[PDB]
Amino acid sequence: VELSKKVTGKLDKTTPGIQIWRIENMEMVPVPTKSYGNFYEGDCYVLLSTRKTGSGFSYNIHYWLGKNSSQDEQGAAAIYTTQMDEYLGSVAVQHREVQGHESETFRAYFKQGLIYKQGGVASGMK
């Protein structure tokens, strides 16, 4: 929870790849490359692509909103993307995505196949 500090304070600064953040349990977590191939569908996943250039790296902070989390959850993943946008150095960008908006855009950053499991991993609700 709160990627900032343990995340926004050290995102991608020298590595070609994209990192996401699982908004499971209605919160957030640093999704590494060992699990960026299957993200629940009914949730939110903040992404952060980083490419190289003739000067530095071009970051891209996206916010996936698998229409399932509560309204605030949509403001939690999108807000985390707004905090890493200025913390990255203003070099990152902002993008919008959803369970029906991350079509070729999300798959675009993922050259393989994206999966979508269930949401609410607390199994303690209804």
Side-chain angles (χ1 to χ4, degrees):
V1 67
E2 305 237 307
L3 29 136
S4 158
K5 200 169 107 168
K6 297 304 185 166
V7 188
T8 322
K10 247 246 290 194
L11 310 175
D12 274 332
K13 311 272 248 166
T14 48
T15 177
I18 55 146
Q19 195 215 158
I20 328 176
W21 277 265
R22 60 202 228 175
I23 302 277
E24 170 174 88
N25 78 82
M26 326 310 292
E27 281 306 298
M28 191 132 177
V29 139
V31 181
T33 101
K34 314 300 281 251
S35 295
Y36 76 102
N38 319 283
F39 20 99
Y40 298 2
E41 79 182 287
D43 327 70
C44 278
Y45 282 72
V46 187
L47 177 152
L48 168 56
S49 199
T50 275
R51 315 131 63 104
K52 45 140 113 85
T53 53
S55 37
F57 294 84
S58 298
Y59 314 142
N60 260 347
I61 305 144
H62 298 236
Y63 55 88
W64 199 57
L65 282 255
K67 190 143 289 239
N68 260 268
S69 82
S70 93
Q71 199 222 141
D72 55 67
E73 264 74 60
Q74 301 198 42
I79 279 33
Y80 273 121
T81 281
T82 282
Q83 304 245 108
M84 61 205 319
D85 236 81
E86 309 244 56
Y87 247 96
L88 274 165
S90 198
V91 305
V93 199
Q94 309 182 149
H95 323 263
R96 78 177 257 150
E97 309 292 348
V98 200
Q99 169 171 310
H101 285 253
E102 93 312 289
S103 41
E104 278 201 319
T105 318
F106 224 44
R107 201 123 93 62
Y109 300 126
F110 297 60
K111 176 167 64 146
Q112 259 206 303
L114 315 192
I115 279 198
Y116 332 82
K117 327 310 287 217
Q118 265 227 20
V121 119
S123 285
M125 314 292 233
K126 292 199 123 134

Short mmCIF file of all heavy atoms in Angstrom, two decimals, residues 11-18 48-61 85 88-93:
data_model
loop_
_atom_site.label_atom_id
_atom_site.label_comp_id
_atom_site.label_asym_id
_atom_site.label_seq_id
_atom_site.Cartn_x
_atom_site.Cartn_y
_atom_site.Cartn_z
N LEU A 11 11.41 4.25 -8.74
CA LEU A 11 10.74 3.50 -9.84
C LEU A 11 11.79 3.07 -10.86
O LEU A 11 12.92 2.79 -10.52
CB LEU A 11 9.72 4.42 -10.52
CG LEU A 11 8.82 5.05 -9.46
CD1 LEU A 11 7.88 6.07 -10.12
CD2 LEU A 11 7.98 3.97 -8.78
N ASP A 12 11.43 3.00 -12.12
CA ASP A 12 12.41 2.58 -13.15
C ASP A 12 13.24 3.79 -13.58
O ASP A 12 12.72 4.77 -14.07
CB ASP A 12 11.66 2.02 -14.37
CG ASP A 12 11.37 0.53 -14.14
OD1 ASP A 12 12.13 -0.10 -13.42
OD2 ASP A 12 10.39 0.06 -14.69
N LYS A 13 14.53 3.73 -13.40
CA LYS A 13 15.39 4.89 -13.79
C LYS A 13 16.46 4.42 -14.79
O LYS A 13 17.13 5.21 -15.41
CB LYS A 13 16.07 5.46 -12.55
CG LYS A 13 15.03 5.70 -11.46
CD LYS A 13 14.42 7.09 -11.62
CE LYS A 13 14.85 7.97 -10.45
NZ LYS A 13 14.54 9.40 -10.76
N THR A 14 16.62 3.13 -14.94
CA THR A 14 17.65 2.62 -15.89
C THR A 14 17.33 1.17 -16.25
O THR A 14 18.03 0.25 -15.87
CB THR A 14 19.03 2.70 -15.24
OG1 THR A 14 18.97 2.15 -13.93
CG2 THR A 14 19.48 4.16 -15.17
N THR A 15 16.28 0.95 -16.99
CA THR A 15 15.92 -0.44 -17.39
C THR A 15 14.72 -0.40 -18.34
O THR A 15 13.69 0.16 -18.02
CB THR A 15 15.54 -1.24 -16.13
OG1 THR A 15 15.13 -2.55 -16.51
CG2 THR A 15 14.39 -0.54 -15.41
N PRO A 16 14.89 -0.99 -19.50
CA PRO A 16 13.82 -1.03 -20.52
C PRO A 16 12.77 -2.08 -20.17
O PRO A 16 13.00 -3.27 -20.29
CB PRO A 16 14.57 -1.41 -21.80
CG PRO A 16 15.87 -2.11 -21.36
CD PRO A 16 16.13 -1.67 -19.90
N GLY A 17 11.62 -1.66 -19.72
CA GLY A 17 10.56 -2.64 -19.35
C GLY A 17 9.39 -1.89 -18.71
O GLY A 17 9.44 -0.69 -18.51
N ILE A 18 8.33 -2.58 -18.38
CA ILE A 18 7.17 -1.90 -17.75
C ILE A 18 6.83 -2.57 -16.42
O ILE A 18 6.76 -3.78 -16.32
CB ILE A 18 5.95 -1.98 -18.68
CG1 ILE A 18 5.67 -3.44 -19.03
CG2 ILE A 18 6.22 -1.19 -19.96
CD1 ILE A 18 4.16 -3.64 -19.17
N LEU A 48 3.78 1.24 -15.50
CA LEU A 48 4.84 2.28 -15.62
C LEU A 48 5.89 1.81 -16.63
O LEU A 48 6.84 1.13 -16.28
CB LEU A 48 5.50 2.52 -14.26
CG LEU A 48 6.78 3.34 -14.45
CD1 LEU A 48 6.44 4.65 -15.18
CD2 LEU A 48 7.38 3.67 -13.08
N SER A 49 5.73 2.16 -17.87
CA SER A 49 6.72 1.73 -18.90
C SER A 49 7.93 2.65 -18.88
O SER A 49 7.84 3.82 -18.56
CB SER A 49 6.07 1.79 -20.29
OG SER A 49 6.81 0.98 -21.19
N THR A 50 9.07 2.12 -19.20
CA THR A 50 10.31 2.94 -19.19
C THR A 50 11.18 2.57 -20.40
O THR A 50 11.63 1.45 -20.52
CB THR A 50 11.06 2.67 -17.88
OG1 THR A 50 10.54 3.50 -16.86
CG2 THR A 50 12.56 2.95 -18.05
N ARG A 51 11.40 3.49 -21.29
CA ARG A 51 12.23 3.19 -22.49
C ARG A 51 13.54 3.98 -22.42
O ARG A 51 13.74 4.79 -21.53
CB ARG A 51 11.47 3.57 -23.75
CG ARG A 51 10.02 3.08 -23.65
CD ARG A 51 9.07 4.22 -24.00
NE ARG A 51 9.28 4.62 -25.42
CZ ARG A 51 8.42 4.25 -26.34
NH1 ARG A 51 7.95 3.04 -26.33
NH2 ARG A 51 8.04 5.10 -27.26
N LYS A 52 14.43 3.76 -23.35
CA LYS A 52 15.72 4.50 -23.33
C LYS A 52 15.74 5.51 -24.48
O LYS A 52 15.03 5.37 -25.46
CB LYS A 52 16.88 3.52 -23.50
CG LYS A 52 16.55 2.52 -24.62
CD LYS A 52 17.80 2.26 -25.46
CE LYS A 52 18.24 0.81 -25.26
NZ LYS A 52 17.49 -0.07 -26.19
N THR A 53 16.54 6.53 -24.38
CA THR A 53 16.60 7.55 -25.46
C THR A 53 18.03 8.10 -25.57
O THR A 53 18.95 7.59 -24.96
CB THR A 53 15.64 8.69 -25.15
OG1 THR A 53 15.90 9.19 -23.85
CG2 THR A 53 14.20 8.18 -25.22
N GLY A 54 18.22 9.14 -26.34
CA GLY A 54 19.58 9.72 -26.48
C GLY A 54 19.85 10.69 -25.33
O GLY A 54 20.82 11.42 -25.33
N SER A 55 18.99 10.70 -24.34
CA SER A 55 19.20 11.62 -23.19
C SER A 55 18.99 10.85 -21.88
O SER A 55 19.84 10.83 -21.01
CB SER A 55 18.19 12.77 -23.27
OG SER A 55 16.95 12.28 -23.76
N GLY A 56 17.86 10.21 -21.73
CA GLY A 56 17.59 9.45 -20.48
C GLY A 56 16.53 8.38 -20.75
O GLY A 56 16.57 7.69 -21.75
N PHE A 57 15.57 8.25 -19.87
CA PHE A 57 14.50 7.23 -20.08
C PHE A 57 13.14 7.92 -20.15
O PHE A 57 12.88 8.88 -19.46
CB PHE A 57 14.51 6.24 -18.92
CG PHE A 57 15.79 5.44 -18.93
CD1 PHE A 57 16.95 5.96 -18.35
CD2 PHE A 57 15.81 4.17 -19.53
CE1 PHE A 57 18.13 5.21 -18.36
CE2 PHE A 57 16.99 3.42 -19.54
CZ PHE A 57 18.16 3.95 -18.96
N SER A 58 12.26 7.42 -20.97
CA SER A 58 10.91 8.03 -21.08
C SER A 58 9.92 7.18 -20.28
O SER A 58 9.56 6.09 -20.67
CB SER A 58 10.47 8.07 -22.55
OG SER A 58 11.38 8.89 -23.28
N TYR A 59 9.49 7.67 -19.14
CA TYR A 59 8.54 6.87 -18.32
C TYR A 59 7.10 7.09 -18.79
O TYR A 59 6.78 8.10 -19.40
CB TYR A 59 8.66 7.29 -16.85
CG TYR A 59 10.12 7.36 -16.47
CD1 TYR A 59 10.57 8.38 -15.62
CD2 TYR A 59 11.03 6.42 -16.97
CE1 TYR A 59 11.93 8.45 -15.27
CE2 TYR A 59 12.38 6.49 -16.62
CZ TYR A 59 12.83 7.51 -15.77
OH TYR A 59 14.16 7.58 -15.42
N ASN A 60 6.24 6.15 -18.51
CA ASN A 60 4.82 6.27 -18.92
C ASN A 60 3.96 5.65 -17.82
O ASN A 60 3.87 4.45 -17.69
CB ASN A 60 4.61 5.51 -20.23
CG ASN A 60 4.59 6.49 -21.40
OD1 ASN A 60 4.50 7.69 -21.20
ND2 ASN A 60 4.68 6.04 -22.62
N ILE A 61 3.34 6.47 -17.01
CA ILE A 61 2.51 5.92 -15.91
C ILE A 61 1.06 5.78 -16.35
O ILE A 61 0.37 6.74 -16.58
CB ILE A 61 2.57 6.87 -14.71
CG1 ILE A 61 4.03 7.11 -14.33
CG2 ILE A 61 1.83 6.23 -13.54
CD1 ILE A 61 4.20 8.56 -13.86
N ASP A 85 4.09 10.49 -11.14
CA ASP A 85 4.28 11.32 -12.36
C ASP A 85 5.21 12.49 -12.03
O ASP A 85 6.08 12.84 -12.80
CB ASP A 85 2.93 11.86 -12.83
CG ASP A 85 2.70 11.44 -14.28
OD1 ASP A 85 2.29 10.31 -14.50
OD2 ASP A 85 2.93 12.26 -15.16
N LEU A 88 8.73 11.01 -10.40
CA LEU A 88 9.70 10.45 -11.39
C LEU A 88 10.57 11.58 -11.95
O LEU A 88 11.66 11.35 -12.44
CB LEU A 88 8.93 9.78 -12.53
CG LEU A 88 8.60 8.34 -12.14
CD1 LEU A 88 7.52 7.79 -13.08
CD2 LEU A 88 9.86 7.48 -12.26
N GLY A 89 10.10 12.79 -11.88
CA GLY A 89 10.91 13.93 -12.41
C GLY A 89 10.13 14.66 -13.50
O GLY A 89 10.67 15.44 -14.25
N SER A 90 8.85 14.41 -13.59
CA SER A 90 8.03 15.09 -14.64
C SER A 90 8.37 14.51 -16.01
O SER A 90 7.88 14.96 -17.03
CB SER A 90 8.33 16.58 -14.63
OG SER A 90 7.29 17.28 -15.30
N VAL A 91 9.21 13.51 -16.06
CA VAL A 91 9.58 12.91 -17.38
C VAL A 91 8.58 11.81 -17.73
O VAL A 91 8.45 11.42 -18.87
CB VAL A 91 10.99 12.31 -17.28
CG1 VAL A 91 11.97 13.38 -16.82
CG2 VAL A 91 10.98 11.15 -16.28
N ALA A 92 7.87 11.31 -16.76
CA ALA A 92 6.88 10.23 -17.04
C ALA A 92 5.63 10.84 -17.67
O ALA A 92 5.46 12.04 -17.71
CB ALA A 92 6.51 9.53 -15.73
N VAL A 93 4.74 10.02 -18.15
CA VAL A 93 3.49 10.54 -18.78
C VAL A 93 2.29 9.95 -18.04
O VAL A 93 2.43 9.22 -17.08
CB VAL A 93 3.45 10.10 -20.25
CG1 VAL A 93 2.46 10.98 -21.01
CG2 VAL A 93 4.84 10.25 -20.87
#
